[PDB]
Amino acid sequence: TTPDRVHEVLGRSMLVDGLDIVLDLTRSGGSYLVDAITGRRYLDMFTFVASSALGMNPPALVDDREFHAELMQAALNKPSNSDVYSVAMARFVETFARVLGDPALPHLFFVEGGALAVENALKAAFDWKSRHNQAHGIDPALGTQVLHLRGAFHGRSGYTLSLTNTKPTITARFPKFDWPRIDAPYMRPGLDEPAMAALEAEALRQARAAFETRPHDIACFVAEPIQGEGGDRHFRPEFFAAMRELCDEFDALLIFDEVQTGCGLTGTAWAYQQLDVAPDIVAFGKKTQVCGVMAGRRVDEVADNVFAVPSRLNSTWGGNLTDMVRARRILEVIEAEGLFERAVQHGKYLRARLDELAADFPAVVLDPRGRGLMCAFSLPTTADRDELIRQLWQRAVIVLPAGADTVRFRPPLTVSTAEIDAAIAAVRSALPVVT
Amino acid sequence: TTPDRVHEVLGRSMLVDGLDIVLDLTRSGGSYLVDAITGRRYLDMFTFVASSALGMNPPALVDDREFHAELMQAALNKPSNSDVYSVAMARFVETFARVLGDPALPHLFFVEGGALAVENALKAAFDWKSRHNQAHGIDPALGTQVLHLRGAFHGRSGYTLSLTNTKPTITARFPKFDWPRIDAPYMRPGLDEPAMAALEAEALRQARAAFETRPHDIACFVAEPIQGEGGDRHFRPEFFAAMRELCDEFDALLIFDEVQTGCGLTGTAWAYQQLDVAPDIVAFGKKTQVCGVMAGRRVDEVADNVFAVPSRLNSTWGGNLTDMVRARRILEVIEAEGLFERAVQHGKYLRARLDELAADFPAVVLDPRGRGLMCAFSLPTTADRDELIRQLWQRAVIVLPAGADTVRFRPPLTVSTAEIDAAIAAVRSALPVVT
Numbered sequence: 001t002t003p004d005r006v007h008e009v010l011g012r013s014m015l016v017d018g019l020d021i022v023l024d025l026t027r028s029g030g031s032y033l034v035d036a037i038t039g040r041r042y043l044d045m046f047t048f049v050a051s052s053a054l055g056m057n058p059p060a061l062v063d064d065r066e067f068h069a070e071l072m073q074a075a076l077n078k079p080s081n082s083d084v085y086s087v088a089m090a091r092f093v094e095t096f097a098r099v100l101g102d103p104a105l106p107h108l109f110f111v112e113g114g115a116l117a118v119e120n121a122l123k124a125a126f127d128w129k130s131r132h133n134q135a136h137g138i139d140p141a142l143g144t145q146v147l148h149l150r151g152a153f154h155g156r157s158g159y160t161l162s163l164t165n166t167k168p169t170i171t172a173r174f175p176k177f178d179w180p181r182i183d184a185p186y187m188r189p190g191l192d193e194p195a196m197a198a199l200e201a202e203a204l205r206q207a208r209a210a211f212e213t214r215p216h217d218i219a220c221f222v223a224e225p226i227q228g229e230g231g232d233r234h235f236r237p238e239f240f241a242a243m244r245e246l247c248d249e250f251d252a253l254l255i256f257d258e259v260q261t262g263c264g265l266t267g268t269a270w271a272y273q274q275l276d277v278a279p280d281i282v283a284f285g286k287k288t289q290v291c292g293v294m295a296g297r298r299v300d301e302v303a304d305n306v307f308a309v310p311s312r313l314n315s316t317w318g319g320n321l322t323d324m325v326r327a328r329r330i331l332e333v334i335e336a337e338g339l340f341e342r343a344v345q346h347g348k349y350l351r352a353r354l355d356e357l358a359a360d361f362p363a364v365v366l367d368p369r370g371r372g373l374m375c376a377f378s379l380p381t382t383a384d385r386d387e388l389i390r391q392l393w394q395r396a397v398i399v400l401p402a403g404a405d406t407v408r409f410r411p412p413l414t415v416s417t418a419e420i421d422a423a424i425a426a427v428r429s430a431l432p433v434v435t
Numbered sequence: 436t437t438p439d440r441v442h443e444v445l446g447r448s449m450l451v452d453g454l455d456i457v458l459d460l461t462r463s464g465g466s467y468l469v470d471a472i473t474g475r476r477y478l479d480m481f482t483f484v485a486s487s488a489l490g491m492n493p494p495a496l497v498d499d500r501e502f503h504a505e506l507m508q509a510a511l512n513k514p515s516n517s518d519v520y521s522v523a524m525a526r527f528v529e530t531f532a533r534v535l536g537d538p539a540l541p542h543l544f545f546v547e548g549g550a551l552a553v554e555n556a557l558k559a560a561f562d563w564k565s566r567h568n569q570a571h572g573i574d575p576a577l578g579t580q581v582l583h584l585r586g587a588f589h590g591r592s593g594y595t596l597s598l599t600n601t602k603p604t605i606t607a608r609f610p611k612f613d614w615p616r617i618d619a620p621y622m623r624p625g626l627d628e629p630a631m632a633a634l635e636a637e638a639l640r641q642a643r644a645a646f647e648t649r650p651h652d653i654a655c656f657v658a659e660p661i662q663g664e665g666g667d668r669h670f671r672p673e674f675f676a677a678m679r680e681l682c683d684e685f686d687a688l689l690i691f692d693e694v695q696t697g698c699g700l701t702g703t704a705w706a707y708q709q710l711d712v713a714p715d716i717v718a719f720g721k722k723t724q725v726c727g728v729m730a731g732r733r734v735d736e737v738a739d740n741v742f743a744v745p746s747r748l749n750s751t752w753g754g755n756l757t758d759m760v761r762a763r764r765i766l767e768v769i770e771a772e773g774l775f776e777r778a779v780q781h782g783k784y785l786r787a788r789l790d791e792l793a794a795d796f797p798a799v800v801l802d803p804r805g806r807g808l809m810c811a812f813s814l815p816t817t818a819d820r821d822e823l824i825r826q827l828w829q830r831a832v833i834v835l836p837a838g839a840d841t842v843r844f845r846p847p848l849t850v851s852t853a854e855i856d857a858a859i860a861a862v863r864s865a866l867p868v869v870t
């Protein structure tokens with residue numbers, strides 16, 4: 001089977017709506033994807049939907065002969081890590097704890113897939129609330145609802161389908177629990193301190209109303225610290241701090257879904273570390289390769305919680321061992337090469353460039369925003385947004401859309417300023433064409 | 436980190452309730468797991484919860500130098516297969532279609548995890564029923580319920596938590612949809628043709644009652660063709676044939692969950708092929724490494740179904756590319772070495788041995804049963820079952836429990852008769868000790 005026949009073969013069995021290229025697995029590297037049909041190189045601001053930390057074939061992985069043998073040992077088989085342990089697994093777990101761990105959140109759980117990571121966070125919370133209720137004289141049948149935001153994206157699985165509300169395509173015709181949803185008080189351009197504070201008070205009022213009308217029945221509040229798929233919507237630390245206090249008031253856990261914000265993209269291990277809010281549970285995925293949760297804080301107040309009692313949480317595999325081995329090497333590179341700090345520095349550079357774009361194209365490049373390497377801007381209409389993406393594709397720059405009118409940048413942590421300049425140069429080229 | 440410190444390290448972060456061994460990734464092979472602490476070899480009738488087709492480090496994979504390079508290419512990165520295609524992916528898809536495909540079920544979809552494979556089958560069905568309703572003058576808000584069996588195990592995710600009903604530990608304190616559940620008319624010892632037929636009529640009556648009291652609202656019937664975790668419970672082809680007809684009568688899809696029965700274990704690619712019942716959707720996982728669904732039959736009667744319309748089903752990764760590359764090699768070995776037929780022959784041998792056990796230990800070894808290599812027997816009490824498992828562990832034979840009093844055998848397809856004899860010899864040793 002030849003590169004030029006890939007779309008043909010796949011097309012017999014599946015819907016083929018992805019990119020026009022065929023990925024060259026060997027010749028792609030760093031911030032470039034190589035199309036195996038033409039050999040054209042594509043500048044990557046997309047990173048497998050923000051799931052690659054270092055880009056393709058990073059040198060510290062490719063040149064590492066000891067690592068090759070470790071990866072191969074892992075890749076040949078697929079053990080059930082949930083009941084068969086190995087040195088390979090333990091090395092990953094201890095380096096995850098070292099590089100990404102939070103002392104307040106010592107309980108780790110691993111699974112394949114981001115939706116299921118969020119779900120295990122939720123299951124942790126339902127169990128917690130039911131047992132916390134029970135211990136305090138309240139009916140243990142209560143504690144089954146999840147407070148969440150408009151524009152949230154948490155996945156496409158049984159539970160997360162009740163939370164996700166972006167495109168109706170994702171959720172239409174699928175059965176949902178009726179869980180309380182509140183407005184998202186995200187930063188928008190041209191709203192000052194008190195204008196922002198008023199918008200937050202309104203979400204807080206909605207959250208508080210939800211807590212009082214479903215007493216003892218809300219198990220947790222879930223949020224993306226920055227909403228990704230919904231359109232790169234950022235929130236002031238003030239909002240989550242108030243939510244944190246409101247959650248404690250009503251004995252409900254605070255879960256951050258860091259599947260997209262996690263693993264150094266915003267400049268720190270986790271976005272919540274910059275918002276100065278302590279969560280009880282963190283769901284991770286994408287760049288971590290293996291997905292899962294970190295839990296602690298109030299979770300430990302219930303002694304027979306989901307992390308202390310056998311067989312409450314499980315999967316056949318407990319995550320992919322190959323993902324585990326790759327991820328620990330990735331983490332070791334992040335740690336040794338200072339890549340969180342590099343994301344801070346380079347994220348400031350990218351942001352500055354988008355501010356310059358906004359100045360030169362004031363009615364077109366709207367609302368430049370970002371935290372670390374997680375950056376975006378908006379266009380006036382969705383037709384303009386889609387056209388800008390097509391135009392960038394023709395210039396061999398891969399970016400992702402989000403929401404109705406956002407273009408998001410998701411470079412690897414290893415992106416250089418020259419690579420950023422080239423991405424920006426391509427946007428300057430395409431803009432007069434869209435206007 | 437050393438083999439003897441694995442349990443210590445893991446224990447700081449997670450609950451450590453798996454096996455006492457540390458898996459030697461390199462020295463394990465075929466039907467033997469090697470403990471890296473002592474070097475003791477363990478006879479494997481467990482196969483990573485039935486998820487390994489060929490056992491550890493199969494020679495056709497280990498000695499294949501071209502395959503090594505392909506695996507390594509795949510293992511170094513983790514592309515989003517859902518939007519970035521590759522030769523590696525297309526080779527897997529076409530060999531899956533060739534070795535395991537069904538002409539009636541041409542739509543393939545891939546995901547990480549068995550629970551999510553079942554869920555995508557369900558989502559396919561909810562969508563189908565809503566659109567089929569709509570096209571026939573019925574409210575499209577109807578079609579949200581799943582008919583299913585007692586003792587069923589379909590996973591631990593949002594939707595499958597409403598279906599799974601084995602141990603209360605798996606499902607307690609988690610929110611569920613109230614979906615119709617019916618009795619499971621499995622074969623039990625000492626019930627003849629009419630006794631069996633009466634028991635089936637009763638489940639059929641319950642199924643029919645469910646259809647008539649929730650009109651147009653049941654989207655599908657799900658079943659394991661042989662119930663695994665619930666205790667290796669087999670059903671006569673007569674039962675599923677009648678269910679097939681009843682499903683057509685009420686315009687509902689028939690989904691087989693073949694995550695455990697699939698990929699040659701019962702002697703054929705799929706168990707349903709031996710029961711002579713055509714499903715509309717098949718969910719697969721475990722031995723396939725990548726999980727997912729095959730769909731067709733009545734699914735194609737709705738032209739804008741989930742397989743024809745973009746973005747209705749998705750995940751970030753669309754399955755693990757490393758799993759895809761490994762699995763196609765596994766499939767090529769199954770095909771070239773005639774391993775389905777070998778499962779038929781060796782499964783007959785194992786069954787015969789369990790019949791001999793039943794004859795020599797008539798009050799202890801109860802209800803020997805199997806299809807292909809999927810075999811089991813029961814003890815009088817669960818205390819006896821647990822003791823037999825402990826005793827076998829001491830003799831270095833790994834088997835799994837199921838249900839209240841079942842011991843299940845899950846050998847690789849490559850098991851030899853000598854290996855079976857050794858497993859049986861160990862059971863004969865342990866039995867007088869348990870009695």
Ligand SMILES: C[C@H](C[C@@H]1CCCCN1C)C[C@@H](C)c1ccccc1
Binds near residue numbers: 316549551592
């Ligand atoms: C591991 C358990 C099965 C369970 C635990 C080990 C021994 C006996 N079983 C009750 C279920 C597993 C297949 C799963 C996980 C996540 C989503 C879906 C499904």
Ligand SMILES: C[C@H](C[C@@H]1CCCCN1C)C[C@@H](C)c1ccccc1
Binds near residue numbers: 115155166229
């Ligand atoms: C791939 C989509 C996201 C979606 C499709 C591609 C472009 C824009 N998005 C609306 C959701 C995905 C993260 C997922 C899958 C399975 C379970 C949970 C979550």
Ligand SMILES: *Cc1c(COP(=O)(O)O)cnc(C)c1O
Binds near residue numbers: 315316590692
């Ligand atoms: C294994 C199993 C599943 C769930 O698989 P996971 O990969 O652990 O999520 C679903 N159905 C059946 C019949 C199973 O054996």
Ligand SMILES: *Cc1c(COP(=O)(O)O)cnc(C)c1O
Binds near residue numbers: 113153154155285
């Ligand atoms: C990616 C995403 C998920 C779902 O991840 P999958 O691996 O595709 O299931 C959940 N939450 C957020 C915020 C995401 O970005």
